[PDB]
Each structure stands twice: as structure tokens, then as C-alpha cells.
Amino acid sequence: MVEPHRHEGVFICRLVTKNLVPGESVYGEKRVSISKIEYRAWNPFRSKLAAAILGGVDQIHIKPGAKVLYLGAASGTTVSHVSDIVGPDGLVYAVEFSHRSGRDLINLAKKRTNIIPVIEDARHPHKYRMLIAMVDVIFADVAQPDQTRIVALNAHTFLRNGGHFVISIKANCIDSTASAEAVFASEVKKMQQENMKPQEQLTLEPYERDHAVVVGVYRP
Numbered sequence: 294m295v296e297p298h299r300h301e302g303v304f305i306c307r308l309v310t311k312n313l314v315p316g317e318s319v320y321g322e323k324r325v326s327i328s329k330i331e332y333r334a335w336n337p338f339r340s341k342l343a344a345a346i347l348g349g350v351d352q353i354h355i356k357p358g359a360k361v362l363y364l365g366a367a368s369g370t371t372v373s374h375v376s377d378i379v380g381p382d383g384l385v386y387a388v389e390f391s392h393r394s395g396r397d398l399i400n401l402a403k404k405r406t407n408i409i410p411v412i413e414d415a416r417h418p419h420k421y422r423m424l425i426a427m428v429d430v431i432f433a434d435v436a437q438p439d440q441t442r443i444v445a446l447n448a449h450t451f452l453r454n455g456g457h458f459v460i461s462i463k464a465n466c467i468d469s470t471a472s473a474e475a476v477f478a479s480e481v482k483k484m485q486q487e488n489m490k491p492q493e494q495l496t497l498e499p500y501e502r503d504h505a506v507v508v509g510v511y512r513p
């Protein structure tokens with residue numbers, strides 16, 4: 294039995310996403326067919342977005358038709374589930390600066406018409422400005438101390454007014470000694486001067502330690 298989750302485009306195999314490319318697995322994940330309609334396993338130990346959803350995040354904003362700027366796409370594992378979610382009329386702009394990871398992303402996009410690989414450094418969005426059109430959501434998982442400044446720069450460049458951000462923050466990646474709680478609070482403090490308004494925060498439960506997701510609205 295597979296049923297729709299509260300989040301549109303997300304499903305619960307009593308977590309899964311509807312396969313944009315039936316019969317194909319991206320990174321070895323298993324799938325289930327319901328009669329005709331194929332779904333792919335979405336693992337919360339592997340995907341911070343899956344973990345947040347299981348952990349009861351109120352909004353993810355990534356939904357059918359959404360245009361998503363994805364910072365830190367890596368090889369495309371979570372990106373592939375985002376691609377399923379946004380569907381044929383949505384888009385996933387997958388920013389990754391590793392050329393090796395880039396190769397897997399590029400190969401992934403060959404099979405998935407809604408993924409746009411962007412193999413560039415997210416710190417310099419002016420360099421890839423022509424490749425990206427305004428987006429509805431920024432999802433960020435770059436694991437960098439300056440991630441908040443990165444998201445802000447990308448927001449001013451690409452995120453529509455009223456658009457949202459979903460930001461994965463590994464505390465010990467910003468400051469290895471500080472309490473996670475103090476790290477989260479410091480990051481959230483930085484957002485006011487960019488007109489980024491946090492709306493919720495949650496930590497990623499048993500899947501990831503001292504790891505928060507912050508969801509908010511930009512230029513509301």
C-alpha cells in the first residue's frame with residue numbers, strides 16, 4: 294500500500310517518491326509498483342530532506358511544478374527525489390562544484406529532463422547567472438561555514454519574492470567546538486539583514502546528530 298503524504302508529491306509506503314523514470318534506479322534504491330505506478334524508496338539516513346519530512350517539518354515548499362535551486366547537489370541522490378517531486382513541469386537546478394560529483398549529476402540529467410546540472414561554485418552566482426531562471430525554492434546542503442552567506446547571495450540573484458529556503462545546517466561544520474543550539478541561533482541571526490525570515494527549525498532526530506533544517510521565506 295502506497296498513499297499520499299501530507300506534502301504533495303511525497304508518498305508513504307505505509308517514504309517514497311513517484312518515479313519520474315519508471316524502471317530506472319538512480320543509486321541502487323529499490324522500488325515498488327502499484328496497479329502501473331512505480332515509486333522509489335527514499336532513505337532518511339541518506340537524505341536530509343527525507344529525515345526532515347519524517348521528523349515532522351511543517352513545510353518543504355518543494356512540490357509538483359516548483360522550480361528549485363539546489364545548492365550542494367553532490368552525485369544527485371536527494372536531487373533525484375526532488376526531481377520526482379517537482380515532476381515534468383518543475384525544475385531542479387543542481388549546483389555542485391566537484392567535477393567528479395558533477396559527472397554523476399550530468400549523467401543523471403541525461404535521463405531526467407527536469408534536472409539542470411550547474412557545475413560551478415555556489416559562492417559566485419554571477420558566474421552562472423545565465424544558466425538559471427528565477428526559482429521558487431532554494432534548498433541548501435553545502436556543509437560550509439559560510440553557507441548562510443552563500444544562500445543569501447543565491448537568494449538575491451535567483452529566488453523569487455515570496456520564495457522559500459530550506460537549509461540544512463550541520464552545526465559542527467560551522468563551528469566544531471560550539472553548542473549546536475548556539476550555532477543554529479547564530480546562523481538564524483545572520484538572515485535578518487538579507488530579508489530572509491525563518492519560519493521553522495527542527496533537528497534531524499536519530500538520522501543525523503546536531504543537524505538542523507531551517508525553513509523560511511525571502512522577501513515576503
Ligand SMILES: CSC[C@H]1O[C@@H](n2cnc3c(N)ncnc32)[C@H](O)[C@@H]1O
Pocket residue numbers: 364365366367368388389390391394413414415416434435436437
Ligand atoms: C551532499 S554533500 C555537500 C556537497 O556540497 C558541495 N559544495 C561544497 N561547497 C560548494 C560550493 N562552494 N559550491 C558548490 N558546491 C559545493 C560539495 O562538493 C558536496 O558535494
Ligand SMILES: [Ca+2]
Pocket residue numbers: 406407
Ligand atoms: Ca528538459
Ligand SMILES: [Ca+2]
Pocket residue numbers: none
Ligand atoms: Ca552580506
